[PDB]
Subunit: 134 residues, 4 copies
């Protein structure tokens, strides 16, 4: 259940918290791992997913050594696009002292599926549709 | 407002800019606004904090292209500022003429807070004055 | 040993891991050694500072592959430590069987510095005892 | 010489440039040489591949500083090139006076290879003369 990410030096900035764009990387890993875990890449012989839009809110900033949990759900799945909701919670600190998980970031992201050359909108592959549903 | 080149570090296996990197180009344009006016976008006890982002992705840019990031102030209040930024591709590395095209747009809201407490304070006079000009 | 997956963020337009990212992987492996034991690789008075890196690049890794970072203490002195790290690809996303292959190796020298001054001091007892194992 | 600004994306929790980022700066400087001659550093069946890096780290750079990347050819063969690249910090964002200081120095070897095979091939004539210049 879910994906867990450790916050490393590479993820932090001079303020001592995770650099804002890195939360998007964590969300991306979560999405791709769903495919990797079914032994496939999130792309196929004549199509690829393309991000259309993101809505993101920032909550308590994460910091070095914390373990973050990325929670993913399908908001909406159509023939031509999918919208995902992803939330990130800090679930552990580096000291492994007891803590109530706290929200760090949330996003809603819309993806289309397109041909590589043309970049024209095509249907999400049936196999990927099934995987998303699950 | 600011121009930057797409380098290998910026691209992914699909041959276009990895999506999150557009947020980096936008951040550079925000910070350079301050840097070129000889200040850091932070001070003694306080920093800007991002509250929310709304971003739209359009035609992807790729290796060696020159991008132009245009930044405008959508809203400026005592305690927050909302910026709208758009990125256009304006040149190929090869130089073949091309009509510039939109690549990305974002609307981002920033607060200003005390570092230690994250308590919201007014955007400091220094930065407010700069943002007014 | 620590394992990492190659994600889109790690790849470049040639479909392989962008070269500098291998250093990030090695860093993760070093930090996890401390994280495992419920501490940060830094304390109240000091931080580790990289002095030098010798790195070699072998067969490139690609999207979805699993890499294993192997770390050994080449040399441990009062004031510095030299770590040798190798990265091997051990799995495909598809789980198609494969002989592991070397991707990257680095030898890095770290000193420990009294923060402010950045002046070199002995590695602390806690890290010393850990680093020995 | 290429100049690069230190942005938040470049810094870590210790307030200095994350170590691997210096390799990115050196890469930009290399690719820009090619982009300026209106070419990408690759052609129809060949790419440059990094084989090895030797690097030393000196005084760290921080937020807002301007870094200058100086590049020279240490060795050019038909098969491979070794470049020496040094990074100096030359200014603060604030323009508070400072004597430029060395931040990073690397020697990097590159081969030119087939994509399909990764078998080495002669550096292209156009690229060989670019490199020599």
């Amino acid at each position: 259940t879910h994906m867990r990410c450790r916050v490393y030096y590479e993820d932090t900035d001079s303020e001592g918290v995770v650099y804002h764009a890195n939360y998007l990387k964590y969300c991306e890993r979560a999405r791709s791992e769903f495919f990797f875990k079914q032994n496939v890449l999130p792309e196929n012989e004549e199509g690829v997913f393309v991000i259309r839009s993101i809505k993101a809110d920032f909550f308590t900033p994460a910091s070095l050594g914390q373990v973050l949990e990325i929670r993913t759900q399908i908001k909406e799945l159509r023939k031509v696009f999918v919208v995902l909701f992803q939330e990130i919670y800090c679930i552990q600190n580096a000291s492994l002292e007891p803590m109530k998980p706290f929200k760090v970031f949330a996003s809603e992201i819309k993806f289309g599926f397109v041909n590589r050359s043309t970049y024209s909108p095509i249907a999400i592959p049936k196999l990927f549709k099934e995987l998303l549903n699950a």
